[PDB]
Amino acid sequence: AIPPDSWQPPNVYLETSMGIIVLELYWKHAPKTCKNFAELARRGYYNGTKFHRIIKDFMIQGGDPTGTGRGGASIYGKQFEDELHPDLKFTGAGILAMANAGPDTNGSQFFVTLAPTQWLDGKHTIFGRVCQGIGMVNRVGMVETNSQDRPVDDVKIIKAYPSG
């Protein structure tokens, strides 16, 4: 069924165990990706999940309800296409983008960058950024991780939701 294109909540909030992150979405550049992320949030799909992979000065990765890094699914019934733009580049911290497993394999997993990551340009859909809470994101990026880059203490998304 998928929400109508008219539904464009400007924000998605992540209430994490370390505080709230306010994301703002790039609806014009990445309409399908924004719809997916906002709708999964609205459904509660991300509630009680964790950032399963964090690498200092790189990014924080989450969005897999199994927590394995292997799972997650979109609202489209299949993995969906990239929405790439040369003029949206990984120029700094706070950028919201899709994790994937190759071209046009978007599901539910996403990441927020901790620094510039331009080697990812053209390979991951950029679909928003942090408007408020970058200080939190910066701190989350520093958490101790194991040899698999999994945080040793869970960093949970307690709740996620779009603007009402």
Add this chain to the structure above:
Amino acid sequence: XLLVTAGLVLA
């Protein structure tokens, strides 16, 4: 290394 994958994580 520095990827953000989903299934086969690389160095």
